[PDB]
């Protein structure tokens, strides 16, 4: 399996049987307004979308590892459907997924439509670029130093959150009919270049 071999590579410190890997989007914990094809890496949004009581999320199979070190993971939009209400990030496991990441406790999310960040807040703070049909968004979390920065089309935003708690999961929601993301947990090389990234980290840590 190219995925397992590239996992290793990437996470040699993580012993898969003690702590699997996320690979892909939980077929169970997600709000029901979620769909799910693509060997369930592609998120679909089904329900109607009137207004932000319809946001649905979705957690992947596990949480994060801490011996990962640094993890990582990236998105790609398939369509922005309507209005490309698309948050992506991190939540703990009793996150309610009737939100987009980022609005509740522990949760943590980066939007599509107004480029804003959102630390376990229904408020957002000016971040980074809005996102949309075509772009590729990237998730990196330091479980050493319980930071996250993301990623546009390869090229990072700075860090968008620190004192995260731990054992967090990867997550996406979505809020308009239309709205389509597939993610990558690694089945395939990153726009980003994380290997090189961890070399840099460890090469600039003070």
Same mark, same amino acid.
């Given at each position: %399996? =190219?995925?397992?071999?590239?996992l %290793?590579? +990437?996470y040699?410190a993580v012993n898969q &049987?003690e702590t699997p890997l996320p690979?892909?989007?939980?077929? /169970?914990?997600?709000?029901?307004?979620?769909?799910?094809?693509?060997?369930? +890496?592609?998120?679909?949004?089904?329900?109607?979308? /009137?207004?932000?009581?319809?946001?649905?999320? @979705?957690?992947?199979?596990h949480p994060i590892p801490a011996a990962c070190g640094?993890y990582?993971? =990236? $998105?790609?939009? $398939?369509? /922005?459907?309507? #209005?490309?209400?698309?948050?992506?990030? +991190?939540?703990? %496991?009793?996150?309610?997924?009737?939100?987009?990441?980022?609005?509740?406790? &522990?949760?943590?999310?980066?939007?599509?439509?107004?480029? &804003?960040?959102?630390?376990?807040?229904?408020?957002? !703070?000016?971040?980074?670029?809005?996102?949309?049909?075509?772009?590729?968004?990237?998730?990196?979390v330091?479980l050493?130093?319980?930071?996250?920065?993301?990623?546009?089309?390869? &090229?990072?935003?700075?860090?968008?959150?620190?004192? +995260?708690?731990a054992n967090l999961?990867?997550? $996406?929601?979505? %809020?308009?009919?239309?709205?389509? @993301? #597939?993610?990558?947990?690694? !089945?395939?090389?990153?726009?980003?270049?994380? =290997?090189?990234?961890?070399? =840099?980290?460890?090469?600039?840590? !003070?």
């Amino acid at each position: %399996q =190219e995925l397992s071999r590239r996992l %290793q590579r +990437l996470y040699p410190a993580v012993n898969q &049987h003690e702590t699997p890997l996320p690979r892909s989007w939980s077929p /169970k914990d997600k709000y029901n307004y979620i769909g799910l094809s693509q060997g369930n +890496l592609r998120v679909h949004y089904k329900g109607h979308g /009137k207004n932000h009581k319809d946001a649905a999320s @979705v957690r992947a199979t596990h949480p994060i590892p801490a011996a990962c070190g640094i993890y990582y993971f =990236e $998105v790609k939009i $398939v369509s /922005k459907g309507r #209005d490309g209400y698309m948050g992506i990030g +991190l939540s703990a %496991q009793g996150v309610n997924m009737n939100r987009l990441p980022g609005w509740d406790k &522990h949760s943590y999310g980066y939007h599509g439509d107004d480029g &804003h960040s959102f630390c376990s807040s229904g408020t957002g !703070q000016p971040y980074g670029p809005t996102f949309t049909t075509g772009d590729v968004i990237g998730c990196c979390v330091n479980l050493i130093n319980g930071t996250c920065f993301y990623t546009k089309n390869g &090229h990072s935003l700075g860090i968008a959150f620190t004192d +995260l708690p731990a054992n967090l999961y990867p997550t $996406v929601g979505l %809020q308009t009919p239309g709205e389509i @993301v #597939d993610a990558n947990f690694g !089945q395939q090389p990153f726009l980003f270049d994380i =290997e090189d990234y961890m070399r =840099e980290w460890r090469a600039k840590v !003070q």
